[PDB]
Symmetry: D2
Subunit: 268 residues, 4 copies
């Protein structure tokens, strides 16, 4: 077997060993994939964690907010996999919001300067990444970002909701350019996963109206999800991501696949 068998996917956004990107990559390799990898500020950290995957694989420094890594990235990657070689898949799995736009901080008190920031990171960078990586992808390719149903408002998620909505729209336009290169572009709207990022929020709000309202929300997934949802286990979202990087969903783009155990399709 080998779903991603001798395919070449740069997975981005790893920063610990239950980061979503991570279990994507793990499952990716269990699966013949052959990965490049990007990381943010503390490379050495990421670097340390990456060292834990089945097989070894290159890591390059990507601060989505500055165009020299943007401008160089396809050079570097082709360096990483050898000139006369092309990307088969790309995994966007970054995302970020100033503490002031989330959890308990009131919605109206987040200042555009910080909103601008996490949009920049969570939404726009899906496009910048696609701009730079597409010139080196093969026909039949696949780009995949990570999504959280921004479709209906909920507590705490606040402005990130707003930036995931932007995301969904950007993904749509990305799929128009992706089309020219023969390339698919989609998001996976994951149910909640226990993650560095998940606990930045769940932590940075603790004892207010929050270690609660969001608590309900949480149990709200497993209750609603006909086949259940286990926030502890990332692999189902990673398999879902793999499915889109594969060739087995050839006819789908500009689109969102919901890996949340059916929750979003259920009212209770």
């Amino acid at each position: 077997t080998g779903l991603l068998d001798g395919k070449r996917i740069l997975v981005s956004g790893i920063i610990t060993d239950s980061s979503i990107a991570f279990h994507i990559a793990r499952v990716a390799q269990e699966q013949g994939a052959q990965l490049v990898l990007t990381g943010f500020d503390r490379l050495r950290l990421i670097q340390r964690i990456t060292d834990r995957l089945p097989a070894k694989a290159p890591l390059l420094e990507l601060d989505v907010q500055n165009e020299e890594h943007l401008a160089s990235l396809a050079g570097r990657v082709t360096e990483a996999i050898g000139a006369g070689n092309k990307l088969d898949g790309v995994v966007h799995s970054i995302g970020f919001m100033p503490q002031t736009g989330m959890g308990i901080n009131p919605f109206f008190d987040a200042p555009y300067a910080d909103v601008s920031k996490g949009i920049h990171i969570s939404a726009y960078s899906y496009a910048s990444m696609a701009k730079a990586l597409l010139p080196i992808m093969n026909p039949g390719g696949s780009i995949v970002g990570m999504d959280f149903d921004p479709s209906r408002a909920m507590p705490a998620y606040n402005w990130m909701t707003v930036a995931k909505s932007a995301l969904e729209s950007v993904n749509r336009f990305v799929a128009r350019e992706a089309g020219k290169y023969g390339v698919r572009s989609n998001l996976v709207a994951a149910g909640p996963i226990r993650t560095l990022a998940m606990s930045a929020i769940v932590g940075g709000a603790l004892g207010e109206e929050a270690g609660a309202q969001i608590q309900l929300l949480e149990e709200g997934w497993d209750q609603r999800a006909p086949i259940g949802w286990n926030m502890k286990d990332a692999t189902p979202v990673a398999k879902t991501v793999c499915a889109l990087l594969s060739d087995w969903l050839p006819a789908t783009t500009g689109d969102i696949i919901y890996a949340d155990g059916g929750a979003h399709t259920q009212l209770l």
Copy 2:
């Protein structure tokens, strides 16, 4: 490899060699699957066509409108794969509408007796099939019906649109019962495929406001679909179906996957 490797899926709804069910099954076997198969009125016909797949495989007589085939079907199937054996996947891919509810016949002139009929067939039978087949499916299973975005009205499709809307809703409830058995239930909303059924409509309307309005509609997919759509080629929808019968979308149910090349996500 072998995406459906030694899995056991009853595929229903085959009636020619570019029926959707067919290319599902083909790709299914190319893929270790091991199929039972059901057919409607002219079994001998279907029987004749089936004979053209990679590997041999059992066919049983299923008129979704009568409960003795419903009542017997799990017996028969377990006969077909051997007592102490269970279904891994089920493919609903039947659907039907009295000529009077479609193409050029005015919308208001279709009588409930005929509407009742094709709903019965197109929508409800997704449930009856799930009722009878679930008691013999394994944890980790997957049911998959076939869908055509009924989300927004269009010309000709008329009442079938209405029955696909019912379908989407039924699929949702099916996924609640499926959940108890560890089972996934989803639809693939295909873009248009050139099919016996497609030409029953496109034929039964020809030269009126129709060999046209629906003509536009048709080219409306390839125009809109960022990675294009080729109505001649069923396999992408079959691969998509396979992906859902696989284990690679573990965390998705009560849901619709759009195999239409991105069209539904695009306005033009």
Copy 3:
């Protein structure tokens, strides 16, 4: 003032004094409207209740399941408002499901014969009514059915969910024919109202997993609804219906307006 000022709307589906149709009609008249009215089996009953509105107004016998009332209805109505006169609005607000397709009865055990029945009533009859009433409506008209978001599955509602999904689709096609006559056609997706019908379900299920699961559901609206929801008070849904029968939403059709206090737009 007089939002529906000297307009002529046949409101159907009244059967008590907190039926939805009722408060539509009340508010309709408070509002210059001038109503015809239809009723189902016990006319004398409805007849008794109707007698409680601001102004007097004609009532005709409409069993949506038989075409002689269908075939005669525009005659009768024009009789009711005087030849050389035309309908300005129509309010469909009927709907019905055999006890066996709802509350606690398992989903898989409802037989198509009963499903067929309540679809027939809940969904198709929106079309039959539009067929017969449109030939006598004025340009600028407005048809309005009643809807309950069938968009996402929930407990108890079972097959009615399925028939509201059909409804939404039918409304879409109705708006295509409505268009020819200058006529708008839309639904109002109400939040839950305490009603004869609401208690047929809530009653016919009482003490099982139901006086509960649906109980949650209920409080689920007021919790989710940013401006709150009071299941005791029909008038907000009636005002919403009036707004669509008015001229103040001129540019909207094939569409659903959510009168549920924002609930459907909120996750919690």
Copy 4:
């Protein structure tokens, strides 16, 4: 009559005599409303145009991008309508995008600095405006922004699509705070209107793949809209806005009303 009868709505975003805000205000006054009004850079211009409405009414200077007009606005407005007085409605109808994020300029070449800009204006400012205006609104109030279905990607609209998606999400959260004050918050998703802004795009792209692709798009509305769409006539969108500022849609918030003649509900 007088739908907005002795109500007090600040309408923003006027800049000519077929600006959307304008016909909102016109219809608003035809309707007893009593308006304050805000304008952007050339006040004198707006000032000149405003002078053309039925009744006279105050205008204040609002550059949504600087918090001294934000910080002062409720002072000024209460000055404008007299201390011990409160807003009944608010109309957000601003929106803006750097030429580089739209029409023919490729999607990937728009730089975050300009995206940030028009989001800031088109989306975020719905919140800042709600922050400052809500402390002076009455229970029963109504805020209304302007929307263009960002739901599905299309040509030219490019990043504005992205900012309308943000908008929809922000509106959802706004309706949560609005709820506390008894206040409704919604958008009207208009079909296309011939407007200063519409021609900034249609003009700034002319003879490329655009005076065309967008041309189709345009005729795409009237074709699809069962009751038709006339891009020349703003009033139907203004009436729709009025309906939401009224009291006749009491039970709807966090929501979008489509004034596009049914187009969005139709495929063709």
